[PDB]
Amino acid sequence: QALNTLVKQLSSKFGAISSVLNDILSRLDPPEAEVQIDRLITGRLQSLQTYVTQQLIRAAEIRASANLAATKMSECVLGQSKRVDFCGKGYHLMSFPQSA
Amino acid sequence: SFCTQLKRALTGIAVEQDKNTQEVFAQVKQIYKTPPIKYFGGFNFSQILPDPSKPSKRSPIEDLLFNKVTLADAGFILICAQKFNGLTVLPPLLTDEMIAQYTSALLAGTITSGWTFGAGPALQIPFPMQMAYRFNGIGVTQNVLYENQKLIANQFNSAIGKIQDSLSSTPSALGKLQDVVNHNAQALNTLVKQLSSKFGAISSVLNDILSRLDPPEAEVQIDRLITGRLQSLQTYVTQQLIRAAEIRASANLAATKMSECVLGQSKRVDFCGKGYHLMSFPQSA
Amino acid sequence: QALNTLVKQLSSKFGAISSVLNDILSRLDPPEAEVQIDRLITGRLQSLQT
Amino acid sequence: YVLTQPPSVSVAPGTARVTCGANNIGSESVHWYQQKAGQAPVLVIYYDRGRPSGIPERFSGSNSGNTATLTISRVEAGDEAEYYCQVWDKSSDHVVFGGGTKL
Amino acid sequence: EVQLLESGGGLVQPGGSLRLSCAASGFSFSGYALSWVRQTPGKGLEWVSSISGSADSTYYADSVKGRFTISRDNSKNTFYLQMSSLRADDTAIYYCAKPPLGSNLFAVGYHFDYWGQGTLVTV
Amino acid sequence: QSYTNSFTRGVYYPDKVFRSSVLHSTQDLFLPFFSNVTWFHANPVLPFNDGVYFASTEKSNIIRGWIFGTTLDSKTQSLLIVNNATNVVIKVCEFQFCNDPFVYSSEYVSQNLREFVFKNIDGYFKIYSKHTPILPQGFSALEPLVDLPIGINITRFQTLLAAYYVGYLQPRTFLLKYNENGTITDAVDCALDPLSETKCTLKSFTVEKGIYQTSNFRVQPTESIVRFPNITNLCPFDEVFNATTFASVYAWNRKRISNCVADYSVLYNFAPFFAFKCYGVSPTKLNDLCFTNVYADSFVIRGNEVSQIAPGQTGNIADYNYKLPDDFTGCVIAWNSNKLDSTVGGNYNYRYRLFRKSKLKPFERDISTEIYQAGNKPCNGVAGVNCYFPLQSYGFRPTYGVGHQPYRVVVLSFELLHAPATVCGPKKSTNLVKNKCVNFNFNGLTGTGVLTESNKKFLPFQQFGRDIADTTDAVRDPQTLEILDITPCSFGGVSVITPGTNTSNQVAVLYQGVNCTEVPVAIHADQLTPTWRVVFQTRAGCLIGAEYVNNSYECDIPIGAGICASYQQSIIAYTMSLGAENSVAYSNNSIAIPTNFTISVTTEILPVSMTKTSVDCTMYICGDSTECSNLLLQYG
Amino acid sequence: EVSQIAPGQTGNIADYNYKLPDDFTGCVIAWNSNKLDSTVGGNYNYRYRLFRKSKLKPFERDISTEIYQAGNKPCNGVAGVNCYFPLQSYGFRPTYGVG
Amino acid sequence: SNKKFLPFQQFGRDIADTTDAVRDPQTLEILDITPCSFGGVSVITPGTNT
Ligand SMILES: *[C@@H]1O[C@H](CO[C@@H]2O[C@@H](C)[C@@H](O)[C@@H](O)[C@@H]2O)[C@@H](O[C@@H]2O[C@H](CO)[C@@H](O[C@@H]3O[C@H](CO)[C@@H](O)[C@H](O)[C@@H]3O)[C@H](O)[C@H]2NC(C)=O)[C@H](O)[C@H]1NC(C)=O
Ligand SMILES: *[C@@H]1O[C@H](CO)[C@@H](O[C@@H]2O[C@H](CO)[C@@H](O)[C@H](O)[C@H]2NC(C)=O)[C@H](O)[C@H]1NC(C)=O
Ligand SMILES: *[C@@H]1O[C@H](CO)[C@@H](O[C@@H]2O[C@H](CO)[C@@H](O)[C@H](O)[C@H]2NC(C)=O)[C@H](O)[C@H]1NC(C)=O
Ligand SMILES: *[C@@H]1O[C@H](CO)[C@@H](O)[C@H](O)[C@H]1NC(C)=O
Ligand SMILES: *[C@@H]1O[C@H](CO)[C@@H](O)[C@H](O)[C@H]1NC(C)=O
Ligand SMILES: *[C@@H]1O[C@H](CO)[C@@H](O)[C@H](O)[C@H]1NC(C)=O
Ligand SMILES: *[C@@H]1O[C@H](CO)[C@@H](O)[C@H](O)[C@H]1NC(C)=O
Ligand SMILES: *[C@@H]1O[C@H](CO)[C@@H](O)[C@H](O)[C@H]1NC(C)=O
Ligand SMILES: *[C@@H]1O[C@H](CO)[C@@H](O)[C@H](O)[C@H]1NC(C)=O
């Protein structure tokens, strides 16, 4: 969905006459074309900035989840855990990993 | 779709809040009840057990904690300015009454069954025997407890009273929750205040621009204002996402502590107190 | 590296005639200077935000 | 435009309610006048809830949906009079008065 | 204080003519759109006519259209209702009504804040 | 004449663009879904409000064409479409039509269910058509048939001969679905009902179970009010523009204008200036605004100095004669006055200051004629070497060029609304409507909201109050001088609760943070948005369409504040149950020891990694554009 | 009035004679024609609409010559008080200014 | 192009609102437009010190 939104953001005008750079370059002289292209560049750079920020936040969450998964692999698969509810509901006997 | 993304992120944060609350508090599927006779071998539990006299059915400690933290907005039916400008607060899915009921169920389970109800069916057990059990877990024989049961009960009651007094008298004891509430309120107030900025336009009011300028120049000024306000919303949403990640980490830690210190006895050092962990009692905030 | 990138971002024009505020103030009248300075301010504020 | 009012209303002294009914009356400004026996009408409510200075706080107004309500809380002996609702028909430029309610 | 005084009411034969005069004081006469409102004894109020402050527009009810004519003299702070071909149903108490400031225009928010003593007209 | 339901008929391709396997939304004149369509059986003329949808079902060649126009008479142009067995003729003429044609007694020329759509917009008459063998409940799109560039004014129309269906298009937002063939196979009317609004918001034709925030309801204004100071005098702008002679720029003449009604549109008649030059305001909107005071500064300069009358300018005129502030708000009007201010031999009456010790502050005048000391030797009040007279004469001559010809300049300085306004436009005031959501205009301050009597203790010099967001929340009426609070009209977010389109089409509507008695019950689409209309009260708001029950179940769809919704034939709302009731049999000497055990295997799923994404800026931002790449290189 | 031939403009020419859309795409070419359209004594062949009930939509033409009712009294098709002819003549003269 | 363009249609647009199919103004046949061959390039080095 993030990739699809990033693609869809290319259809936005961001206040320019058109969302297509070729249309601006063919309809306007280099000064006005530069103005419109600057507006489009600002919009698309903002879109990329937002995508990268959300990707960084999601990557931090995924890294926390992966650290938890590594801890569970070390403490429930490689050994027997006395911690309550860490490796199941009842008293932990063992654990088996499966790739996803 | 910038605003679609902003709304999606805010909805995700709102859902994650209820998810965190459910993870922390909804740990048991049975609403256990304390026996009518409030005797547990001399161990007083009145300061942590729910009070039937209060309409909220909250314990004195929970009532004091509720009074100690003031909420800027509970989400029920500066705040007027936030509402008029499109900023609203959604109420949490679980009410304070339901969280208090979950806490009381956990208290009843850990008092009447020890750690058994956390690993399966609740098995009744006398409380002094359970405390002897926890003495065994920290490496102390049962006789040490059974020959000093009255002293242990008196020390526990005195410690509970001291905890209540300290929470009642400390000027800043609930600082974390108050800081969270203040951060949210300050973020909303800053978002409201950002509407007074011109962002290089002739005026910060759209009506003034529309009444003073023709549609082309009005469009230019409105584009500048829109860029400024969109940047403000972007910054607010990013900071809210970061704060939500921090709160989710804190809630995961709280759920782990509820599982390992309340539903059982933890051998981990400093995880559930300073000394050798005997038990833990949750209280809603 | 973050600090060095923040420093290096001051050399960008961000669509303005120059990356130096003094050059804009000395080459342009206050209206056009305000336009160019607004562009520079937007660019540098975005850099600080990032 | 036609304004509909009950012919009369009765209530115990010391909660009187008068209703003015019309189609889409919620979008129209309704004004309430009080007229005693042999006396000129006196404006008691304007703009559906506006109370002029000197009028007792017993009188209150509302206007919603398809009805406008004039409420007199703790009705006294001197409050017994004829109450009229009045609007200004936009479609015809006519000042339309209510039927009249006596209590 | 604002003061309105009616005069001219009396007895008239059916199908005849009559003129009512209302004198005003205490407010800027040229800026208010004044009204004539009649009430039949035992019945409810009924708006009769209205005239604007500049006397450039007159408004009449459908029941009295053509029969009645409203006019005003701003130099004299008075305004008149000249009726002709009076029917038997025209017997009523007539009041000259003034709107408050802020609602002095014959428009959506038009209403009355002061009422005159009124004059009885019998046909 | 009968009435019937249009079902999901009335759909055409809104552009010439090929689209496939896509969900595209748009806004156009569309026939509403399930619309009150009039079924005529065959003769007054029918109207043409925002287009027409026409449908025919007759097996015989009975309906021959159509007539469009406004009055169907030779005073105006009328458009006639006729068909026969081999050709179709379109014509535009001032026909004198008969009142029951079947055609006329006396430009443009163009050569099973049957649906047509006629639109008249942008100077184009677009006809879309479709033929579908067997109104049917099926879905079919109308392909464009013809586009007439006639640009004719159309308000009424009639058929030309026998039953036919007529519907009227409305401005609607539609979500169309394009299949692999590129043919519109399904559509959603975004304003039909809450479910369709949810579908449009989610950009999908299928909705999963849950609660979705679609939009926000907002009460629309009922009236428009205008409040202006009671001013009848006309501003004496003729005394400024039509002056016989103008002052010198060194002694520019200032005229105060207040307590009058200003009609700037007549200014063009006073002087033959080509155009205005306004800063911070447009000449178009000057008649719609109020000002505390107006200042008319009149002088005469050279043509090449006209550019110096502007904010931020320097030079002789700007530095030493007439300076405008950087934040100047007003207009500058300069026109050539060669025929009036130039004489043969030189007009030396007009002078400008050439030397001064310091630059003038904005709106400062210097009429001193003291000798300027250019050097260090004092002049002692005597002109000579390094001591010149500060004023230099223009010496205008008719033979000079346009840059040297005299120009008369009038600068209008406007004071924005901070004090009571004294200069206003020709706008007429209305009554002060209170306690209703209206559009208000107070001395040019335009807004929408409810005006109520204010208890705020305004000081006599204060005219309006501002809130935290720097927006006007209280205002003083310019005529009654009373304080009014401005409150935004009733509004609030709306959530749609659905069990999923795969289960049922029934939905519930939650007005968030809104008292159940405050839910709008407007019967007109113009008084409330959205146009669709649909009872329990929760701390989360007002829930409509769900039946509250006393039973407790697990939370299916979280409404909030302990309230959840579920589908059980109908949507029900309830208080979620925390869990099963239990009670441990505690005792002084009782224990429970397990006699069995169960080996339980549970599953825990933990994400480890996400998708690794690489983005190339040059392609995304520019995409093989050298100019865009060069411009992007400036962003660091 | 040349400035009135532009998107977003109001005024007599824009409101009642010739209106351009806000999203107008095209060009406007205006040149002085004093030597061709001005005569001594006044060229009264060129007229513009001065009064109209409502503002024109973009690319709309109104050639009606009916009497405009400024006030509330009907004109009955006769020009007089508060009832003026909708078209006013320019009366161009060579001695006029560039505006 | 194999796209079934309707007679009134002259070009087709993709998700990014860019022209991906066009009708030739003279031959009236439909043509698909595909961006020219491209792709990212990575450089693997053991280090300049080696
Ligand atoms: C709006 O104001 C006009 C003009 O009034 C003038 O300007 C105001 C801003 C104030 O400064 C006024 O004091 C000032 O006169 C009002 O119309 C005018 O009303 C006054 C009554 O207050 C009339 O004066 C009277 O005129 C007659 C002659 O006909 C004398 O007999 C009286 O002695 C007295 O001077 C005046 O004629 C009248 N002018 C016009 C053109 O109608 C107007 O009433 C006011 N509107 C409201 C709603 O108050
Ligand atoms: C357990 O503790 C509570 C309070 O901490 C005791 O209740 C107190 O009882 C005394 C004497 O009966 C009263 O004077 C106090 O006011 C009570 N305090 C409160 C807060 O209600 C209770 O007695 C203790 N339990 C036992 C079994 O002794
Ligand atoms: C303890 O529980 C187990 C359940 O796993 C019991 O085993 C079942 O016993 C019943 C009755 O004999 C059999 O019908 C089932 O087939 C057994 N299940 C399995 C999986 O073997 C066991 O009998 C119980 N033991 C005691 C002492 O109560
Ligand atoms: C359609 O419109 C007619 C005419 O206003 C009305 O009588 C009828 O109730 C409407 N609805 C239906 C479903 O026919
Ligand atoms: C159809 O109309 C056209 C145009 O008037 C005419 O030329 C043609 O002969 C007609 N055909 C028939 C079959 O009537
Ligand atoms: C698309 O067109 C093909 C013809 O090549 C046809 O067979 C197919 O059924 C069409 N798809 C749909 C969904 O109708
Ligand atoms: C200026 O005033 C003179 C008389 O003083 C008058 O004839 C002339 O028409 C006025 N100018 C304009 C443009 O109306
Ligand atoms: C809604 O309004 C009623 C009366 O106006 C009030 O009693 C009730 O408390 C309000 N609802 C809520 C949830 O407060
Ligand atoms: C348990 O002990 C307490 C204190 O000795 C006493 O109150 C209670 O009655 C005893 N018995 C039971 C069955 O609870």
Residue numbers in the entry:
A (entry chain B): 957 to 1056
B (entry chain C): 758 to 834, 849 to 1056
C (entry chain A): 957 to 1006
D (entry chain G): 3 to 16, 18 to 95, 95A, 95B, 96 to 104
E (entry chain F): 1 to 52, 52A, 53 to 81, 82A, 82B, 82C, 82 to 100, 100A, ...
F (entry chain B): 26 to 67, 81 to 140, 159 to 162, 169 to 173, 188 to 210, 216 to 242, 263 to 635, 642 to 675, ...
G (entry chain A): 406 to 504
H (entry chain A): 555 to 604
What wording appears in the published article?
CryoEM was applied to elucidate the molecular interaction between MO11 and the BQ.1.1 spike ectodomain. The refined EM map was evaluated to be at the global resolution of 2.3 Å, and the atomic model was built as the complex consists of a spike trimer and three variable heavy and variable light (VH/VL) chains of MO11. All three of the RBDs revealed to take a “down” conformation in this complex. Three VH/VLs of MO11 bind to SD1 and occupy the spaces between two adjacent NTDs. Each SD1 broadly contacts MO11 across its interface of VH and VL domains, and one glycan extending from the N331 of spike SD1 runs along the outer rim of the MO11 VH domain. MO11 has contacts with several linearly distant regions of SD1; mainly 529–538 as well as 552–555, 322–332, and 579–582. The loop 529–538 is located at the center of MO11’s footprint and is in wide contact with MO11’s complementarity-determining regions (CDRs), i.e., H3, L1, and L2. Notably, the CDR H3 loop extending to SD1 surrounds the sidechain of N532 protruding from a flat surface of SD1. A glycan chain attached to the N331 sidechain is visible in the cryoEM density map and runs along MO11’s VH. A stabilization mechanism was also suggested for the murine antibody S3H3 because of the interaction with multi-segments of the SD1 of the spike trimer, although the details of the stabilization mechanism are not established. Since MO11 also holds the SD1 across the distant segments of SD1, i.e., the SD1-N and SD1-C labeled in Fig. 1, those segments may pin down the SD1 from the trimer surface, contributing to the stabilization of the SD1 fold and retaining the S1–S2 connection in the context of the dynamic nature of the spike trimer, and thereby, MO11 may prevent conversion from pre- to post-fusion conformations.
